[PDB]
Ligand binder design. Structure first.
Ligand SMILES: Nc1ncnc2c1ncn2[C@@H]1O[C@H](COP(=O)(O)OP(=O)(O)OP(=O)(O)O)[C@@H](O)[C@H]1O
Ligand SMILES: CN1CCC[C@@H](Nc2ccc(-c3ccc(C(F)(F)F)cc3O)nn2)C1
Length: 818
């Protein structure tokens, strides 16, 4: 008769027109979902809400599963609700999906046994919708699974009895697993929202997902929020300015939830005729401020309130009934008070439960429970469950304990916490950090950036400085401004760190990290800085070099691998080399520092007081043209001993240039990395000359070249020289065969300095190895790995090599492949 899908769209539009779908909105004002402030969405590249499920750029491969990850408060629910409304309004997926089914994971039970009847309860009031009709057909239906991490109770990601078929009733965990794994109603689309931490389990269900990260408000979007929140423009501007002046809070406000909390606080202060001051610095300070302002205008119910929250965390319960409120001393009068002020919500769409306005608030109270003046009240058992899904990870519960357990405390509710307990907890928290600071990642989590968000929450230097004494090595990945703010605070107070590794994720290409590099330059203990494999391009190097010229820098080793640097950055690197007398090791591998960049770099390398000892220029798009400048550096440098230039186009002519100066007996070169440089036997006479004259050269790496047997003979003329002191010779993958074995054998029985000789991916043959075995027994000085890896031989040869290892144990390592 009529198309029932129209009624469903009408239902969705009337239901999702508001932000919460719940009452107690500070007098239940209309929240107006049209206020939605745009969130930043990055595909793992910026994307639009439309075309989200389109096939990718090759093979036209379709996507069924899309996962949206983000922090608590970033807007995963407001965004998923927005999609429901936009679709129902005909502004999104108009010709892609016939239905959108919104699944609220805080309502789904992992214990209760049910068929796929959620499709009934999640839609119109009609108790008997046409489930068996065309709505049963996949490819036109998208499910929105909102809050994977909010599922209450243990969840097993590995299930034997997957139980497909929507008609069969089964446990919620099994049912969700089959839906996520696309075994139940396959070829349907599924969108999942989750906190990044819960991906530890979800990753096993998804198989081949598309991932999108949700980022909060840009500075422009923060302003829009305030202007939309406050209908009075004069107030909106005053509020914005007050916050803008608070750099720390402004930074935190990238999270929509933080903006909401702050705005609500200011609104209440306006109504009461207060100063409107907002001086919060930490997440805890913001939450305490908010709750205090609401409780001030009652406060004797804090115990029951906190106890309720704590129970919910331990028993995995978010939704409460009147019985649960009464069981904790909450009954009607105070409950209503907590609806007038926005602490609880009841739900308005023909439902009656109670819950906290946000999971972070429930966790806040659950944390405060431990400090007041009944699951445990033992912080030890709490911490033991930190990394577990089963308890909701307790990330904010612990993070808030750090903030609450602080000597720098004030009045209003906070004063009701016990000082004796606070000290007991404080000490346990220090022990917890010491233990977690020394651990393997293993996807478990108090991840160093996380221990730093914990430390940031308490500004007490006496605590933080001691906590930071457990981090001799810091490895972190920063994606947002808040990550930098937190990292800088902790590093500024760390006097033990010797090695620091900083990753940068899509927000370098800019100066975002300037406020962190300015910290590193004042560190006295830091000696090694690793900034590899991140987009620290030219402008980023300029900032770093500015800080490396600081008189107290003390950085000795700097690793700059795939940083996206070009020749211009060498100008600034040179300036550092000409001033900073402490820098010893510099790795510039895998950059675009072509011949010109080296010419510039060499200006610093040839400078008096440049003490650089080790330089890596591997895969830097170099060719023979630059060898003239490198040769000049080798000729005069008093400190450069290690030079690695492989994986470049330094052909025979380039090597001959370097050799012309390297052969000088006064040259300090000790290790030469002429690896995958396209050398042939033509240049071996040059290398031979160097070996014969330069007694300081101890390591030569020629693997990947094509020297052949002729090259070996030429090198042997030098290697067999009485004044040659080479200790390590690597000739892997040099296109050598059995015809060179006579000369290699001669080397083994004549060289006095050789200790390690490495042959590898080449057709040495069985005759070759057997001949070596027969001479390696005759008081050979060779002690180290003989190589012969990635080589295959007959049974006799394998036995002979094993025999040699037992008979002549001085040659400890042969390293056969089998
Ligand atoms: N785009 C937006 N515009 C304005 N406010 C927003 C937006 N996104 C989120 N908020 C604010 O954030 C608060 C809660 O955020 P939200 O509940 O979406 O966080 P979440 O952790 O993603 O949710 P859930 O835990 O339910 O998945 C709301 O009170 C709302 O005011
Ligand atoms: C688990 N941990 C690993 C290391 C990186 C860290 N990243 C974030 C991102 C965001 C927030 C965050 C902080 C305060 C708030 C509040 F104020 F709204 F409560 C809401 C948040 O979402 N906290 N940590 C997560």
């Amino acid at each position: 008769k009529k198309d029932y899908r129209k009624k469903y769209r009408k239902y969705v539009r009337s239901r999702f027109q508001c932000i919460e779908d719940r009452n107690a909105r500070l007098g239940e004002s209309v929240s107006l979902n049209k206020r939605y402030t745009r969130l930043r969405l990055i595909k793992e590249s910026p994307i639009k809400m439309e075309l989200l499920f389109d096939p990718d750029d090759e093979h036209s491969e379709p996507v069924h599963t899309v996962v949206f990850q983000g922090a608590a408060g970033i807007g995963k629910t407001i965004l998923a609700r927005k999609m429901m409304l936009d679709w129902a309004s005909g502004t999104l997926y108009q010709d892609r999906f016939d239905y959108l089914f919104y699944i609220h994971c805080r309502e789904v039970s992992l214990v209760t046994q049910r068929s796929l009847g959620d499709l009934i309860m999640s839609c119109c009031p009609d108790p008997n919708p046409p489930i068996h009709k065309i709505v049963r057909k996949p490819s036109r239906i998208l499910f929105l699974m909102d809050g994977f991490d909010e599922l209450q109770g243990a969840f097993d990601e590995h299930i034997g009895p997957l139980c497909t078929d929507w008609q069969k009733a089964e446990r919620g965990d099994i049912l969700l697993s089959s839906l996520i794994r696309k075994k139940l109603l396959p070829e349907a689309s599924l969108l999942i929202t989750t906190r990044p931490v819960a991906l530890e389990k979800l990753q096993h269900l998804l198989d081949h997902p598309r991932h999108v990260e949700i980022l909060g408000f840009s500075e422009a979007k923060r302003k829009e929020y305030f202007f939309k929140y406050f209908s009075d423009e004069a107030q909106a501007r005053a509020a914005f300015s007050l916050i803008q002046e608070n750099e720390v809070l402004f930074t935190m406000c990238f999270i929509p939830l933080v903006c909401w909390i702050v705005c609500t606080g200011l609104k209440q202060q306006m109504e009461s005729g207060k100063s409107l001051a907002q001086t919060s610095k930490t997440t805890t300070a913001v939450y305490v401020f908010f709750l205090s302002s609401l409780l001030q205008p009652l406060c004797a119910h804090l115990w029951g309130l906190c106890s309720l929250a704590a129970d919910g965390i331990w028993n995995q319960k978010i939704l409460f009934e009147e019985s649960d409120l009464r069981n904790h001393g909450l009954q009607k009068a105070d409950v209503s008070a907590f609806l007038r002020m926005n602490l609880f919500q009841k739900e308005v769409d023909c439902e009656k439960f109670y819950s906290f306005i946000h999971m972070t608030f429930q966790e806040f109270f659950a944390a405060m429970y431990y400090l007041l003046e009944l699951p445990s009240r033992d912080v030890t058992v709490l911490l033991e469950n930190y990394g577990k899904f089963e308890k909701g990870y307790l990330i904010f519960v612990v993070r808030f304990l750090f903030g609450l357990v602080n000597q720098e405390r004030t009045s209003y509710l906070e004063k009701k916490l016990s000082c004796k307990i606070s000290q007991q907890i404080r000490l346990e928290l220090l022990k917890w950090i010491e233990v977690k600071a020394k651990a393997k990642k293993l996807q478990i989590q108090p991840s160093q950036l996380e221990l730093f968000y914990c430390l940031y929450e308490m500004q007490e230097e006496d605590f933080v400085q001691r906590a930071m004494d457990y981090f001799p090595k810091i490895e972190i990945n920063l994606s947002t401004r808040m990550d930098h703010m937190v990292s800088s605070f902790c590093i500024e107070n760390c006097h033990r760190v010797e090695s620091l590794s900083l990753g940068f994720l899509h927000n370098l290409t800019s100066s975002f990290c300037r406020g962190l590099f300015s910290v590193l330059s004042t560190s006295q203990s830091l000696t090694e800085l690793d900034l590899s494999d991140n987009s620290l391009g030219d402008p980023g190097m300029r900032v770093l070099c500015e800080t490396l010229q600081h008189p107290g820098c003390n950085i000795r080793r700097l690793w700059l691998g795939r940083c996206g640097l070009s020749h211009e950055c060498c100008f600034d690197i040179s300036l550092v080399l000409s001033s900073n007398q402490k820098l010893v090791e510099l790795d510039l591998s895998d950059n675009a520092l072509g011949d010109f960049g080296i010419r510039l770099l060499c200006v610093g390398l040839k400078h008096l007081l440049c003490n650089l000892k080790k330089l890596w220029l591997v895969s830097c798009c170099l060719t023979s043209a630059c060898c003239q400048d490198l040769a000049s550096v080798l000729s005069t440098s008093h400190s450069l001993t290690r030079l690695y230039v492989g994986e470049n186009a330094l052909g025979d002519s380039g090597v001959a240039i370097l050799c012309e100066k390297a052969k000088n007996p006064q040259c300090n070169l000790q290790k030469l990395g002429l690896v995958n440089s396209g050398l042939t036997s033509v240049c071996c006479s040059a290398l031979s000359s160097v070996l014969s004259t330069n007694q300081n050269l101890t390591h030569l790496y020629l693997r990947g070249n094509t020297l052949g047997d002729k090259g070996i003979k030429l090198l042997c003329e030098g290697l067999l020289h009485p004044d040659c002191k080479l200790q390590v010779l690597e000739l892997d993958n040099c296109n050598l065969t059995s015809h060179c074995c006579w000369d290699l054998s001669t080397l083994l029985t004549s060289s006095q300095s050789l200790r390690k000789l490495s042959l590898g991916n080449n057709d040495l043959g069985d005759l070759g190895v057997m001949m070596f075995c027969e001479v390696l027994k005759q008081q050979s000085c060779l002690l180290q790995n003989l190589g012969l890896s990635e080589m295959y031989f007959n049974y006799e040869t394998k036995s002979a090599l094993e025999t040699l290892q037992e008979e002549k144990p001085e040659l400890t390592v042969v390293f056969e492949p089998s």
